[PDB]
Amino acid sequence: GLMQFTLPVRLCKEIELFHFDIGPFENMWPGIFVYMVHRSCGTSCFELEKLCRFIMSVKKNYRRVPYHNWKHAVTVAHCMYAILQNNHTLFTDLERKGLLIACLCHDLDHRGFSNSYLQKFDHPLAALYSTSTMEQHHFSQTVSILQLEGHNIFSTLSSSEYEQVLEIIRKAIIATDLALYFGNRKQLEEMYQTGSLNLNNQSHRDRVIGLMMTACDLCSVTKLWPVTKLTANDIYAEFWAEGDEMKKLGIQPIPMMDRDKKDEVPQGQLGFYNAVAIPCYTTLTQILPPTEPLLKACRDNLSQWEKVIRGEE
């Protein structure tokens, strides 16, 4: 009960910054996550024994793929921790609880393949879930683990507080389907600009949590250049494996997934920063001004990709 988690001084200070890298020591990531729950939620949010057992079952259910792995889960949760800590008074007790768990769980049991590949392979999961295939699976795996004995971290919540948090988590995880982000950000753009955005309106809060989920999920583009550059290799290593599997089904993959077209990566990153990342962190900064360091870091990385194209590195 009087048991803090504490971190070495360099981590204690840097973990509060949006651009923090959780580092290569896997055995420290559980403690980093518990540290973040304790500071953003409280030492009383979860029974430590249950939380530790829940974290280790979540870890066990992430696969050894190059990008959509346990490191990505904890990275996306740290970005959410940074957003929550810079926007102290905007979020409910239940939202603080639900969103760090949602982030840790959002890619549970990912196989390194897109919704599109599952649909073309005719994977069983594509028949069970016609849209946001992997994301409905991730929520389903979250509920499974919550129902393991000794794993219900929400046990002290009332019946209706419990249903509310599981509903925050479901919407948060569904929102990580990037196909839904474009529409969601357009609506948030219009609401903010006509002045109709209202954070007492639940359907509005939902949209804003959706955008935060996109922002955390994409946070590799908000790191220092050497982190951003090295994560991009992991990201393309999955896409190219998927491209290879598309070719096995007799389908030319899109160039993004075709390892023969590696040369167009710098130009593909530009498109991505311009069409997805910058718009994402721009609208997030408009709604939540203290998240501006994410937009600034993203702009700095776009400018580094421009330098790569000009052969200045």
Ligand SMILES: Cc1nc2ccc(CCc3nc(-c4ccccc4)cn3C)c(C)n2c1C
């Ligand atoms: C967090 C993060 N999430 C993602 C998701 C997708 C992409 C890939 C962008 C991208 N490359 C291409 C491309 C590359 C080589 C040849 C032809 C086309 C097209 N397109 C849209 C990146 C870089 N991401 C990052 C950095």
Ligand SMILES: [Mg+2]
């Ligand atoms: Mg995902």
Ligand SMILES: [Zn+2]
């Ligand atoms: Zn993800």
